[PDB]
Every structure is written in C-alpha cells, then in structure tokens.
Amino acid sequence: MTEYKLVVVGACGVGKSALTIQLIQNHFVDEEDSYRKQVVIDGETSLLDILDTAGEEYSAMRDQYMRTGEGFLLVFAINNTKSFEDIHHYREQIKRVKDSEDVPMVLVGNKSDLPSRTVDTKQAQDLARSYGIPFIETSAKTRQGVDDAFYTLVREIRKHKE
Ligand SMILES: Nc1nc2c(ncn2[C@@H]2O[C@H](COP(=O)(O)OP(=O)(O)O)[C@@H](O)[C@H]2O)c(=O)[nH]1
C-alpha cells in the first residue's frame, strides 16, 4: 500500500482544516490538524497522511512533516489578499527545508463560494504558472475542487517519483 505524506500550508483561517475535513470526513461546519485515511486514486490504493499547518506550538513535528512531506498544498483564500501574499513565503520555506527546487506542490484558492473576492483568478493562475505548479479553485463548503486539489497533488508526487 502506497503512502503519501501531505502537508497543507497557508495562513490562519484560509480553510486548511475545512478542506481536509471535507476530503476525509465528507462534511463542513461553518462554526484536528492531522488526518489519516486510505482512498483510491486512479485505481491505486493510497494511504494519505495529512498535516495542516500555518507555521503552531508543535514546531518539531512541523519540521519533521516539512522534511518528510512528499507534497504540499499552498492554500490561500480568495477573500484574503494577505493570505495570497503569504504564499511565496510558504513556498520558499518548503524549498529551503527540503533543499530542492523540485518539490510537488499545488496552489489552492479556497472559499470560491464566497462573493467577496479580492484575489483574481488570473493573479493566482499567473503565480502558479511562474512556479510551474497546478492551480485549483476550491470550496470546502460546496466541495468544489476538493478531491481534485488533493488528487492532483498525489499525481504531482507520482510524477516526481518516476
Ligand atoms: N464559506 C466558506 N468558508 C470556509 C471555507 N473553508 C473554510 N471556511 C471557514 O473559514 C474559517 C476558517 O477555516 P479553518 O478550516 O479553521 O482554517 P485554517 O486555519 O486554515 O485551518 C471557518 O469558519 C471555516 O468554516 C470555504 O471554502 N468556504
């Protein structure tokens, strides 16, 4: 059974936990930072071991997951300009800890269901293009893009491993 260690990074409140809950537990409440579940992606049974982190008290565990993380979701919220601005910092942090320019990553613009938008889709597409990674628009509330975000990351890890 293939195992993938995934890390979901981004500013506080962008919906990292909400995205992961929706993926793993299939629900959303508008009111756990680690998850572990087996799913089937493209017919391959895959154990996902996931950490959600903004960069929290358990720094040692964070450093471990950053070092061993095989793929990263870089999450911002479409109604949070600062969270979009923070993405570069998170990506640079990952590249440094992993000592590599070729780390599987997906850019995720969450809260796509909300009518308040301050980050344009073109801005995000442009940034992802510069990084050479996929961009996926998501909503943890409506499930838009959720499986696609995580499964695309798993596919980016596979591309990296072979
Ligand atoms: N409308 C909407 N609210 C969301 C979405 N994702 C998260 N939230 C809400 O945003 C707030 C912060 O989410 P949370 O998962 O705790 O963010 P985290 O700090 O990145 O883990 C919560 O009130 C969530 O219900 C989304 O896609 N749409």
From Swiss-Prot:
One of its GO terms (biological process) is striated muscle cell differentiation. Its main location: membrane. Changing residue 13 to D: In GASC, JMML and OES; also found in a breast carcinoma cell line; somatic mutation. Its EC number is 3.6.5.2. Keywords: Acetylation, Cardiomyopathy, Cell membrane, Cytoplasm, Deafness, Disease variant, Ectodermal dysplasia, Glycoprotein, GTP-binding, Hydrolase, Intellectual disability, Isopeptide bond, Lipoprotein, Membrane, Methylation, Nucleotide-binding, Palmitate, Prenylation, Proto-oncogene, Ubl conjugation. One of its GO terms (cellular component) is cytosol. The keyword Isomerase does not apply. Changing residue 13 to R: In pylocytic astrocytoma; somatic mutation; increase activation of the Ras pathway. InterPro entries: P-loop_NTPase (IPR027417), Small_GTP-bd (IPR005225), Small_GTPase (IPR001806), Small_GTPase_Ras-type (IPR020849). The keyword Glycoprotein applies. NCBIfam families: small_GTP. Ras proteins bind GDP/GTP and possess intrinsic GTPase activity. Plays an important role in the regulation of cell proliferation. Plays a role in promoting oncogenic events by inducing transcriptional silencing of tumor suppressor genes (TSGs) in colorectal cancer (CRC) cells in a ZNF304-dependent manner. Interacts with PHLPP. Interacts (active GTP-bound form preferentially) with RGS14. Interacts (when farnesylated) with PDE6D; this promotes dissociation from the cell membrane. Interacts with SOS1. Interacts (when farnesylated) with GPR31. Interacts with RAP1GDS1. Interacts (active GTP-bound form) with both SHOC2 and PP1c (all isoforms) to form a tertiary complex; SHOC2 and PP1c preferably bind M-Ras/MRAS, but they also bind K-Ras/KRAS, N-Ras/NRAS and H-Ras/HRAS. Interacts (GTP-bound form) with MAPKAP1/SIN1; inhibiting K-Ras/KRAS activity. This is GTPase KRas. The gene is KRAS.
